Design a protein around this ligand. Sequence first.
Ligand SMILES: *[C@@H]1O[C@H](CO)[C@@H](O[C@@H]2O[C@H](CO)[C@@H](O)[C@H](O)[C@H]2NC(C)=O)[C@H](O)[C@H]1NC(C)=O
Ligand SMILES: *[C@@H]1O[C@H](CO)[C@@H](O[C@@H]2O[C@H](CO)[C@@H](O)[C@H](O)[C@H]2NC(C)=O)[C@H](O)[C@H]1NC(C)=O
Ligand SMILES: *[C@@H]1O[C@H](CO)[C@@H](O)[C@H](O)[C@H]1NC(C)=O
Ligand SMILES: *[C@@H]1O[C@H](CO)[C@@H](O)[C@H](O)[C@H]1NC(C)=O
Ligand SMILES: *[C@@H]1O[C@H](CO)[C@@H](O)[C@H](O)[C@H]1NC(C)=O
Ligand SMILES: *[C@@H]1O[C@H](CO)[C@@H](O)[C@H](O)[C@H]1NC(C)=O
Ligand SMILES: *[C@@H]1O[C@H](CO)[C@@H](O)[C@H](O)[C@H]1NC(C)=O
Lengths: 49, 120, 254, 99, 162, 99, 50
Amino acid sequence: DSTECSNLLLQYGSFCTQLNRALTGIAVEQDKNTQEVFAQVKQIYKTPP
Amino acid sequence: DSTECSNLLLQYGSFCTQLNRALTGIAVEQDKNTQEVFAQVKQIYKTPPIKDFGGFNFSQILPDPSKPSKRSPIEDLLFNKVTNGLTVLPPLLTDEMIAQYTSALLAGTITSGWTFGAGP
Amino acid sequence: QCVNLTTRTQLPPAYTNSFTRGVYYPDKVFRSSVLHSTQDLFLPFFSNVTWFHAIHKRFDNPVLPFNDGVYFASTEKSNIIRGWIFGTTLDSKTQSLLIVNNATNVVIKVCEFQFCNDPFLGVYYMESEFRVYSSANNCTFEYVSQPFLNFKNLREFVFKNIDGYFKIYSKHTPINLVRDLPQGFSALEPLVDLPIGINITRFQTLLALHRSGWTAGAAAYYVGYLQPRTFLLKYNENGTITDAVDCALDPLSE
Amino acid sequence: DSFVIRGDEVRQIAPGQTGKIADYNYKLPDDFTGCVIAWNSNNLDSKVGGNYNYRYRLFRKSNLKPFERDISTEIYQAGSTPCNGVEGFNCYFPLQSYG
Amino acid sequence: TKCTLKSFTVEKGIYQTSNFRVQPTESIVRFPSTNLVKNKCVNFNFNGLTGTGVLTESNKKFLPFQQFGRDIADTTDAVRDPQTLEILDITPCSFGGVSVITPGTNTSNQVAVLYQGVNCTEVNVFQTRAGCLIGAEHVNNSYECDIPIGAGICASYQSIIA
Amino acid sequence: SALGKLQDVVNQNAQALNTLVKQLSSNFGAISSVLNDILSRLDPPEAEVQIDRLITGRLQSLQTYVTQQLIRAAEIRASANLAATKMSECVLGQSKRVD
Amino acid sequence: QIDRLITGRLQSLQTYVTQQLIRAAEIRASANLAATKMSECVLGQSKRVD
Ligand SMILES: *[C@@H]1O[C@H](CO)[C@@H](O[C@@H]2O[C@H](CO)[C@@H](O)[C@H](O)[C@H]2NC(C)=O)[C@H](O)[C@H]1NC(C)=O
Ligand SMILES: *[C@@H]1O[C@H](CO)[C@@H](O[C@@H]2O[C@H](CO)[C@@H](O)[C@H](O)[C@H]2NC(C)=O)[C@H](O)[C@H]1NC(C)=O
Ligand SMILES: *[C@@H]1O[C@H](CO)[C@@H](O)[C@H](O)[C@H]1NC(C)=O
Ligand SMILES: *[C@@H]1O[C@H](CO)[C@@H](O)[C@H](O)[C@H]1NC(C)=O
Ligand SMILES: *[C@@H]1O[C@H](CO)[C@@H](O)[C@H](O)[C@H]1NC(C)=O
Ligand SMILES: *[C@@H]1O[C@H](CO)[C@@H](O)[C@H](O)[C@H]1NC(C)=O
Ligand SMILES: *[C@@H]1O[C@H](CO)[C@@H](O)[C@H](O)[C@H]1NC(C)=O
């Protein structure tokens, strides 16, 4: 919450944006991985009773 | 172009050589990838002039003679639908040569089936 | 010479919507076919802009704060609005800025004016009446320039004071709307940068009387206040700002 | 390197200093290694009538290199008028003595 | 190439060895001052804005307030002369990589040089899309790729042919 | 959105280049991001410090860019190896592998 | 002092993001393998040995 630290951090540019974007890419990649592995059928089948 | 900056930059060593070497490795890797994907045949096969394939139509995937780029209608649509010390090196295989490789693969798989992939 | 105006009618000032007005060019840089994000003192979109009237008997010359900057809009016909007063105490104790546009030219003077309570210009039915200040002793900056100027004309100005530099931005718009601010977009061109170097916290609008007592011509002006915020400006192929996005207005624009 | 200077000029015998004897008498490099030694010599290097035997370069066209010595007693042109080796208006001797 | 690879024997191939920058021939100052020199790589100082570039006549339509033009990357790509109100594009001076195409030193000591992304008029001269190639003769015959140059162009030894 | 996979790679590469060029506008704690301004405004003892701050910031930016370029190169190489496998097994023969 | 803390924490965060990207590439390769096994071993009978 230090405003002076953030003011000094703004001198370094868009490093934080790159880190956030990389983490966002990893986060959507995990959901894509689960989607590719498990969602290979569009019909929900059931066994007979 | 600052001489003083370069003199101070020499104190850090061979970082610049490492970065240039890594970028060069990536640049040659892209060409190797294109060779591995598209250059799998050493014979440039061509379709017969008469397109008598027993009712099968391949006009949308074979190269169009009317187009100067010698691309298929599908390939032409695909190409239309994709839009301080930095340099961009051109790829070793141009788009017309990659299209020629795909045309050779299409001609081989249409006229010869899977035989051209395993031998003559 | 000073004259008290004692025939005014008491009425509260009005408020209206800013819509998408008050956008000015942030710098002198040409940009073409680009989207540029800038953090500067801007007027927020759809903000509450204060509305003042001049009608007959309304003559609105109150004392307003300047704050970080002032957006001044004018729905004007027949040329009543003539200039502005900037300063802190508006007397000979401090140094004040005068902007006037009389019948011949535009005059900017930075002097220690002993201002009147009701500064005004006058038109006789020709201009032969000027009562703004009673004295001017120490003058540092003088600048004489060209004339800047149903309601038919829309005048937008942006006044900013940063680092001793007074930035005035201007835009002239042909309009045909009767009462309020038209809804649309018009980027304000930079008009002048003055190295005045004086403290400004209060400002005054200068009007012109019509004499044939006195009569006030039909005019209306709007005062808005600038806040530090980010805009996304769109530059077309001709280098003109054609659209803007307020980055902190709503989540869609964010 | 031995010399005699003023008492306020001992801060100028240092790397990276701006000053008068730093520019026109004795310059130290930015990568200087070593020690500067200074001690008061009012009992030895001073006279009641004025010890004028120690001189400094008041006037020069350009700043020295580090470890550069200038003993050239050529005239300086401090104005638009050329001096031609002759003192005159804006033509001064570069070496002036401490009082 | 031997100095760059730190070896006295160089294998067959293309090796990035240096960087070619077109040096500023003159320095130009324009204040509200020196003469205006166009179509050359010069240093420029327009109203305190310093830089290095090639000044060309521009077709841009700067409005009166506007003075110097910036591109996408906020580099000054166009500038207005403060004395004669005309617009000039500032193209960056020609820079590129210098690559040495050679066969093995066991085979031959002949080399060719490729200036990447540099036209041949700002440096056996052959203009390719990859850049300007000096020292290799261009032939109309087509062979298999031996040393890759780029943009469909390859080099071989038979003298060095491209 | 049919061709999103290629457009994603093109957008990522262009965005990485734009970010790397944009990082030059940052001063990284120095007084200015322009080398000429520092060299013309300050003496070399403090200009060396300011240039050093700019050098370390730009070098960190360039190393970061090279790092994500290598990671993306690995991803593209894996995709290209998969594409070569599909070209060998689906185009040059008939594959019994499901999906 | 704050600048020293900023550069240290930024270096730590860059290191963390870089190793997370490398692990993400490894997990993506494993997930692609798992999707291949799902398609070829579960949804069909595979002639591929082991
Ligand atoms: C194969 O398919 C192509 C494309 O569908 C056919 O070309 C069409 O021919 C009709 C009749 O002359 C034209 O009206 C269409 O405009 C043509 N389409 C295109 C894209 O050219 C072609 O006739 C089919 N048959 C053969 C034997 O080639
Ligand atoms: C116009 O009205 C203003 C407001 O009443 C007058 O200003 C006052 O002047 C008297 C002079 O005796 C002062 O004592 C008051 O303190 C002033 N008030 C303010 C708020 O400044 C002004 O003098 C009037 N003009 C004329 C010409 O009489
Ligand atoms: C503008 O402000 C006034 C009071 O200052 C308030 O009564 C009015 O509702 C406001 N208008 C809007 C649109 O918020
Ligand atoms: C306008 O103001 C200027 C500056 O005081 C003055 O010289 C000029 O005569 C004025 N014009 C009229 C018509 O009053
Ligand atoms: C301002 O004016 C007054 C009276 O005219 C004078 O006494 C004072 O010295 C002036 N100050 C300056 C800074 O000119
Ligand atoms: C300007 O004036 C206001 C009120 O008179 C005061 O609070 C502020 O400190 C002044 N600023 C300067 C820079 O003098
Ligand atoms: C840009 O200017 C040209 C003529 O110079 C005009 O035809 C075109 O419509 C303009 N573009 C816009 C968006 O106004």
